[PDB]
Amino acid sequence: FRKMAFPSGKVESCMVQVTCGTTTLNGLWLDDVVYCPRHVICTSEDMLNPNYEDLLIRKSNHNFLVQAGNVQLRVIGHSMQNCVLKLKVDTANPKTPKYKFVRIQPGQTFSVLACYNGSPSGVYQCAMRPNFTIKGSFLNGSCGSVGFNIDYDCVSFCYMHHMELPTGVHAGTDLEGNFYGPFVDRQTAQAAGTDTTITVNVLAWLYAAVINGDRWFLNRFTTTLNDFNLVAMKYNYEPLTQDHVDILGPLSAQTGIAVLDMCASLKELLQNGMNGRTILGSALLEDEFTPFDVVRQCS
Amino acid sequence: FRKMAFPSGKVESCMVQVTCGTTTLNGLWLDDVVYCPRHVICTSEDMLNPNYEDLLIRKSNHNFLVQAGNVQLRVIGHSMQNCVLKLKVDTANPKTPKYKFVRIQPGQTFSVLACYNGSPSGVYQCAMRPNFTIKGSFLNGSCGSVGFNIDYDCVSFCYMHHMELPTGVHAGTDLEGNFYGPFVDRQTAQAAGTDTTITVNVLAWLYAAVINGDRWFLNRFTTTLNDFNLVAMKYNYEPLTQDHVDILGPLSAQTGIAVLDMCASLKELLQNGMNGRTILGSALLEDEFTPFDVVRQCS
Ligand SMILES: *[C@H](O)[C@H](C[C@@H]1CCNC1=O)NC(=O)[C@H](CC(C)C)NC(=O)OCc1ccccc1
Ligand SMILES: *[C@H](O)[C@H](C[C@@H]1CCNC1=O)NC(=O)[C@H](CC(C)C)NC(=O)OCc1ccccc1
């Protein structure tokens, strides 16, 4: 099984560039609103400790250069919502898809359309880590790139990119401008908390292995959810939620392997290792495939 | 550093559904021609051992149902070029990109847009293996999905999907209908030649590991090109040519690590193994990033 992004075309048609002075980044053009990171209004020097309310007071509509390719879209209104700017423009995007703004949970995956100067450059799958970072691939000028899922031609936007942490991982907001995690948009030294392994996704990957015939690791034991959660944390695995149990439902039904039975199989893998054996050809337990990713890739 | 695909929107606008009898697959709609695998004209019994020229002479234009979204396109002509069928339609694709048909070489990479019933489903990066298979994610109905590279508005189509081998790897043609590898479009179990590892790509990926702050595998040894190639061939790695050494030039200059110094690193890696350590989070030596892939992503 492979990491597979959603086709990016519906989002590509919504990418624009936003320039303030000499600072350019990307924006998301939906209907007659362009969404973008608010630090576009910062000069290099203002990014250490910016006062965004004060910086925005000095800006008018005419200070914002919004372009779709080289075609200017005139800004007729602006406001700030948390860490994002909303620039109302005079043209409704004719390629606006059916869309939603959603806030995802750690463990959930999404496709990222990496953009520079409003031009799409690449697409790849990311998982939100439990420490609310993503392991992305972003360069200078990538801010305003978005992450999304597509469900039946409806695009659910979940991520907008703002910053890189000193460990090389990345941090950003939802499309209402609220950061994932304890991060802020200031060019200050920030540290991601210690990360953990996404337990629900490892279990999804064990089900994927079982579906394909690799089931040596199935054992004869079961566990309670609470006992599993307490042992999992000793191995720096995330605890399972009730929602996690429910989204494993379809895979449990397909294989006939109860969710808590698979938890006991995983627990034995953590307490004893894999004893030189592999699962789906890998000696490592993969944790960036969700139960939906497994179902979507097998269907 | 992630496996990154090209944005797929320009190709999405070209995918259509092609039905003949009870067989359905995807087609690529460029200008007024639809390109699709020729086995669409085959029934179940036909597939087992088809005589394609004999099967195609007995087909009429109206035997082909081409659908672009909900709208049927009328077939007004049809010819066969090797394993690809060219259906002339009465409507030109209004969103035909600037495009070229190219045949790639083993070791080169491309993006795959996986499609079902003419609708795009996922996008991911593949490399043409030295044995001319690709390790894809394809299911029933995915034939006619295409692989491509994008260079400044120009889409270079290099692959069209036709089948899955018993080992689970995949085989297909260029857009002139010629298979990559010794394969045929017949429903029969076929084996590929013994595969080898793409050495120039492993070296590019090791440079990506260093660009991203990982150096544990480096050493103070050096090696000649020929002495490296002796060990490489012993481990079923493809030979490294002087052209490969040149293509790695920019990556060596960026890191200050001479290519033959990185070859000594890989030689030690091959002879000792990874000792259960990881490089860019991988327990295996990755060979599906070309030097260009690394440069584009890392700069
Ligand atoms: C937006 O394009 C840019 C994306 C960064 C740049 C390179 N790779 C990325 O992910 N975002 C920033 O440059 C961001 C702006 C702040 C106002 C949020 N600052 C940043 O990422 O630097 C982080 C940093 C923290 C502490 C010391 C030095 C740098
Ligand atoms: C086209 O949609 C389909 C794609 C395959 C189906 C499952 N995963 C894929 O990638 N191609 C075929 O079904 C292909 C048609 C032949 C006429 C070329 N046949 C095939 O892939 O099976 C080959 C095979 C034959 C005998 C034993 C085992 C495999």
- B48 is written with which tokens? 């087992």
| First-last CA distance in chain B | 11
How many angstroms is it from B279 CA to the middle of ligand 1?
A: 25
- CA–CA distance, A73 with A51 (Å, rounded to integer): 27
Q: Is A13 exposed, middle or buried (0-12, 13-18, 19+ CB in 10 A)?
A: middle
- Return the ∠ at Cα B117 (arms to B92 and B192), rounded to 5°: 105
> CA–CA distance from A239 to each of A230, A231, A236, A250, A263 (Å)?
8, 9, 9, 20, 11
| B185: nearest Cα among B16, B41, B7 | B41
- CA–CA distance, A296 with A152 (Å, rounded to integer): 12
* Chain A interface includes B299 (CB < 8 A): yes
Do the beta carbons of residue B144 and residue B115 sit within 8 Å? Answer: yes
- For residue B116, give the 3-state DSSP assignment: strand
Q: Is B258 exposed, middle or buried (0-12, 13-18, 19+ CB in 10 A)?
A: middle
Q: Which amino acid is at B273?
A: G
- Closest ligand to A164 CA? 1
Indicate which of B6, B26, B111, B123 best probes the interface with A, i.e. most A CBs within 10 Å of its own CB. B123
- Taking contacts as CB-CB distances below 8 angstroms, the residues of chain B near A296 are 122
Rounding to the nearest 10 degrees, give the CA dihedral for residues A171, A13, A4, B217: -50
By what technique were these coordinates determined? X-ray
Residue A63, number of CB atoms within 10 A of its CB: 13
- B143 is written with which tokens? 């034939």
How many angstroms is it from B117 CA to the middle of ligand 2?
A: 16
Q: Which residues are within 8 A (CB) of A74 and not within 5 positions of it... i.e. 6 or more apart? A: A66, A89, A90, A91
Pairing label, strands A71-73, A65-68? antiparallel
The distance from CA A149 to its chain's CA centroid, rounded to whole angstroms, is: 9
- CA–CA distance, A218 with A204 (Å, rounded to integer): 14
DSSP code for A137: -
Q: Which residues are within 8 A (CB) of B54 and not within 5 positions of it... i.e. 6 or more apart? A: none
CA atoms within 13 A on the CB side of B83: 23
- Residues of B marked as catalytic: 39, 143
Do the beta carbons of residue B184 and residue B207 sit within 8 Å? Answer: no
- CA–CA distance, A204 with B226 (Å, rounded to integer): 46
Residue A151, number of CB atoms within 10 A of its CB: 11
How many angstroms is it from A161 CA to the middle of ligand 1?
A: 10
- CA–CA distance, B135 with B106 (Å, rounded to integer): 13
> CA–CA distance from A273 to each of A195, A212, B129, B224 (Å)?
20, 21, 32, 40
Residue B12, number of CB atoms within 10 A of its CB: 19
* Chain B interface includes A289 (CB < 8 A): no
- CA–CA distance, A208 with A255 (Å, rounded to integer): 9
Q: Which residues are within 8 A (CB) of A247 and not within 5 positions of it... i.e. 6 or more apart? A: A200, A290, A291, A292
- CA–CA distance, B39 with A157 (Å, rounded to integer): 39
Who lines ligand 1 at CB under 6 A?
Answer: A 25, 39, 47, 138-143, 162-164, 170, 185-190
How many angstroms is it from B78 CA to the middle of ligand 2?
A: 23
- CA–CA distance, B292 with B248 (Å, rounded to integer): 9
- CA–CA distance, B133 with B127 (Å, rounded to integer): 9
Do the beta carbons of residue A103 and residue A113 sit within 8 Å? Answer: no
Element holding A228 (H helix, E strand)? helix A225-234
- B133 is written with which tokens? 């298979």
The distance from CA A109 to its chain's CA centroid, rounded to whole angstroms, is: 6
Do the beta carbons of residue A83 and residue A37 sit within 8 Å? Answer: yes
Q: Which amino acid is at A163?
A: M
- Category of A208 on φ-ψ map: left (φ > 0), alpha (ψ -120 to 50) or beta: alpha
Q: Which amino acid is at B22?
A: T
Element holding A116 (H helix, E strand)? strand A109-116
| A66: nearest Cα among A52, A77, A53, A54 | A77
What is the 3 state secondary structure string of B26-75? EEEEECCEEEEEHHHHCCHHHHHCCCHHHHHHCCCHHHEEEEECCEEECE
- CA–CA distance, A13 with A3 (Å, rounded to integer): 23
- Return the ∠ at Cα A286 (arms to A285 and A291), rounded to 5°: 120
Sign of CA dihedral B135, B141, B144, B150: negative
- Taking contacts as CB-CB distances below 8 angstroms, the residues of chain A near B10 are 9
- CA–CA distance, B208 with B289 (Å, rounded to integer): 9
Nearest by CB to A122, which of B5, B114, B278?
A: B5
- Taking contacts as CB-CB distances below 8 angstroms, the residues of chain A near B212 are 168
* Chain A interface includes B214 (CB < 8 A): no
Do the beta carbons of residue A109 and residue A289 sit within 8 Å? Answer: yes
Element holding B17 (H helix, E strand)? strand B15-20
**Contact B9/A13, CB-based, under 8 Å?**
yes
Residue B123, number of CB atoms within 10 A of its CB: 26
- Return the ∠ at Cα B161 (arms to B158 and B162), rounded to 5°: 135
| First-last CA distance in chain A | 12
- For residue B227, give the 3-state DSSP assignment: helix
- Residues of A marked as catalytic: 39, 143
With a 6 Å cutoff on the Cβ, whether B191 touches ligand 2 is no
CB pairs under 8 A between A and B: 81
- B69 is written with which tokens? 């979204």
- Taking contacts as CB-CB distances below 8 angstroms, the residues of chain B near A1 are 137
**Contact B8/A13, CB-based, under 8 Å?**
no
Do the beta carbons of residue B121 and residue B114 sit within 8 Å? Answer: yes
